[PDB]
Design a binder for this molecule. Structure first.
Ligand SMILES: *C(C)CC1=Nc2ccc(NC(=O)Cc3ncc(Oc4ccnc5cc(OC)ccc45)cc3OC)cc2C(C)(C)O1
Length: 297
């Protein structure tokens, strides 16, 4: 980590009264936390109600998870607004357990969206079919959001389609479900030491040395691109995470192109998976490379 979230300040301008929230359905839940849909009255100054997403801890949570939710709130507050990041709207740190209030993204996580849209995908009307133009736009927006996070000295550590949200106008927003994900029952997380980690998305230096950098997030972005252009398929299909998997990645085995990736997008993935972190493109370089591909299209 480059930044210390605990030394980050918390602006009380974010403070929102919890009695002005009406909780609805659970959007996501893990062992210690959950994301819940809510209606916030008096969030908009004109007295119009609005839908928000609220992250909070369950009574099952410990001191570690309580500190983690406060650190998460300081980090979100520090970042500020960006179009490709889930935006903080408010919080409640007084009169009860910590509540983190963000904007609500109506289409939910990108992975589930892609899987639902898989069968009606068109490479090139009212029906709202998913096209190659959308996948290229999602690639671009995620690289833009990640370029912004890197400029703010943020290392995500869990960049994957499951941590990307989709909202109005095909706008993608990077988020981090964290504790509001059931990692114990998610097959995308594997037991590694006394941790349950997303190994198929992790750079070799993160797997073998527990090192997380700007460059290890680029590797995960390469994996994200593979999920995107395979329309939500799990990476390294038919390959379980075992000693052979670790050996193969260390030796240079890399996934072949997903079925719908343009050759120029597969070229980005190959560079994101370079064994040498210094040879990987930066998110800024990726943004410029995709912008160019979008124009030429
Ligand atoms: C720098 C260290 C990088 C960094 N860190 C970081 C940490 C923590 C977060 N938190 C969240 O994103 C919190 C959060 N995540 C997801 C979420 O779920 C939502 C939100 C909106 N709409 C949703 C709609 C759904 O279905 C319709 C389902 C879930 C939804 C909510 C939420 O907080 C309420 C983020 C970061 C980032 C990535 C900024 O960077």
């Amino acid at each position: 980590s480059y930044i210390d979230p605990t030394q980050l300040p918390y602006d009380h301008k974010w403070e929102f009264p919890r009695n002005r929230l009406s909780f609805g359905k659970t959007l996501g839940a893990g062992a210690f936390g959950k994301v819940v849909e809510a209606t916030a009255q008096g969030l908009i100054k004109s007295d119009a109600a609005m839908t928000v997403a609220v992250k909070m801890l369950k009574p099952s949570a410990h001191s570690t998870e309580r500190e983690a939710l406060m650190s998460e709130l300081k980090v979100l507050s520090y970042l500020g607004n960006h179009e490709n990041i889930v935006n903080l709207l408010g919080a409640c740190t007084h009169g009860g357990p910590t509540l983190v209030i963000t904007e609500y993204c109506c289409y939910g996580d990108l992975l589930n969206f892609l899987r639902r849209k898989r069968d009606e995908f068109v490479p090139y009307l009212y029906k709202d079919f998913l096209t190659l133009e959308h996948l290229l736009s999602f690639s671009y927006q995620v690289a833009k959001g990640m370029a912004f996070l890197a400029s703010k000295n943020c290392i995500h550590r869990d960049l994957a389609a499951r941590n990307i949200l989709l909202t109005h106008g095909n706008i993608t927003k990077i988020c981090d479900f964290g504790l509001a994900r059931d990692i114990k029952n998610d097959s995308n997380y594997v037991d590694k030491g006394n941790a349950r980690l997303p190994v198929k998305w992790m750079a070799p230096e993160s797997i073998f040395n527990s090192v997380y950098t700007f460059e290890s997030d680029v590797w995960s972005y390469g994996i994200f691109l593979w999920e995107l252009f395979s329309l939500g398929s799990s990476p390294y299909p038919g390959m379980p995470v075992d000693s052979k998997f670790y050996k193969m990645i260390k030796e240079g085995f890399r996934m072949s192109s997903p079925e719908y990736a343009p050759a120029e997008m597969y070229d980005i993935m190959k560079t994101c998976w370079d064994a040498d972190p210094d040879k990987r493109p930066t998110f800024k370089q990726i943004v410029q490379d995709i912008e160019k591909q979008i124009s030429e299209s």
